[PDB]
Nucleic acid binder design. Sequence first.
DNA 1: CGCTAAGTGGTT
DNA 2: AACCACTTAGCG
Length: 61
Amino acid sequence: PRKARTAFSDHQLNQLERSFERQKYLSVQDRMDLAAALNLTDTQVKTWYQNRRTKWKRQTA
DNA sequence: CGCTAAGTGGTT
DNA sequence: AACCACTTAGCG
């Protein structure tokens, strides 16, 4: 079974985008800290970072 | 549809 | 274990 697609809250997307604008990569500890602060799993944040770096490369052209 | 979350297969 | 490059697929 695929895992169900996460629907991020406004709060979670806002903080994820702010984190990404500051740092394109996070250390393990920063990734875990951000996940905890946003009530997300480590994997949800890791996955969001990774997909966000894909978008960042597309838009940098 | 537009945007993007999760899965695959491979690289680092 | 995390990333990459791409693929599959859900939801506003």
